[PDB]
Amino acid sequence: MEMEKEFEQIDKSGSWAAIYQDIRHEASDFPCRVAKLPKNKNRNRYRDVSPFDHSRIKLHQEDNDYINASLIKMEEAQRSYILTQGPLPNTCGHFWEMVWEQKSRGVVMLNRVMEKGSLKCAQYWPQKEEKEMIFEDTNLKLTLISEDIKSYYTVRQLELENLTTQETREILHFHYTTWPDFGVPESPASFLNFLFKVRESGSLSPEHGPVVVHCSAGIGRSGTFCLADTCLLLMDKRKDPSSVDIKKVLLEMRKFRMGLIQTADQLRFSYLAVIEGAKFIMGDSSVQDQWKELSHEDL
Ligand SMILES: CC(C)(O)CCOc1ccc2cc(O)c(N3CC(=O)NS3(=O)=O)c(F)c2c1
Ligand SMILES: [Cl-]
Ligand SMILES: [Cl-]
Ligand code: NA
Asked: Annotated cross-link N,N-(cysteine-1,S-diyl)serine (Cys-Ser) - which positions?
């Protein structure tokens, strides 16, 4: 593939940092006026990570519609994602309000609550069936229904209830627990095994609202996940691996949220994941079982 040839050339010349810096230099800069309003200071986890105004998710409330969340609409791939920061103690109600209003079926969490000795995300979902969470400010209730615990990720089935109408929805929560802050997954196989677990759930399908993807800031790990998924979907459309330009796809995504993919090694890993995933897209369905084995998800 042209993607494989490009990877080989960058590796041989040792120019991942330069390629990655080129992307940062060419990336879109759009205003984030709402994110920077004084009233929204305590709704942002990081001073330097904000949603662009043009693509921010608006909460459907009159008081304050702001959440640090972006709609990434990949027009050619025909898939949308919401990328958001790890909720703060005061924005967990907003987070589930967004999930409800945007009709999302899945939440993909790529971080842990504590990383490198600091708190990176609130405990925004219940870990025990009998201890449900009630978000009084947004009139929502959230109950853990079941979970499937694997070695490096956990899938949870949640029930989200609109307390105003008593309507309920199933939310699937995919928690990747071994992807370090500013780091990469253990292998392409472990990443792809997890990505296709998300896909198989239906959470990425167009009948539902956009999947909500987050890490701590919602850009490094979240960007890597969504770049790989979109590239594999583009390749699927006409079964043509050489028709995917990873750097171009990443620049397109960065029109919708700043800073997606935060290290040169996350960019390199993205290539690895797409190159390996291409084996499945191009017709070797058996490689999915191989990824499951190589991921050691039982062990
Ligand atoms: C957009 C810009 C100009 O580059 C400024 C980026 O400023 C920041 C500030 C704090 C961060 C904290 C994170 O934990 C983080 N993560 C690393 C990962 O791999 N995933 S992440 O959770 O998104 C970030 F990327 C951050 C980026
Ligand atoms: Cl740690
Ligand atoms: Cl970490
Ligand atoms: Na190869």
From this structure: 215-216
Q: Number of structural domains, the chain?
A: 1
CA distance 184 to 269: 7
**Documented resolution in Å:** 1.5
Q: Which residues contact 25 (CB under 8 A, 6 or more apart)?
A: none
Ligand 1 contact, 262 CB (< 6 A): yes
AA letter at 270: S
Pocket test for ligand 1, best of 23, 29, 32, 46 (most atoms within 8 A of CB): 46
DSSP H or E run through 70: strand 66-74
**Please, which experimental method was used?**
X-ray
Residue of 32, 92, 121, 215 marked catalytic: 215
Query: Burial of 183 by CB count in 10 Å (0-12 exposed, 13-18 middle, 19+ buried)?
Result: middle
**Direct distance between the N- and C-terminal alpha carbons of the chain, in angstroms, rounded to an integer:** 34
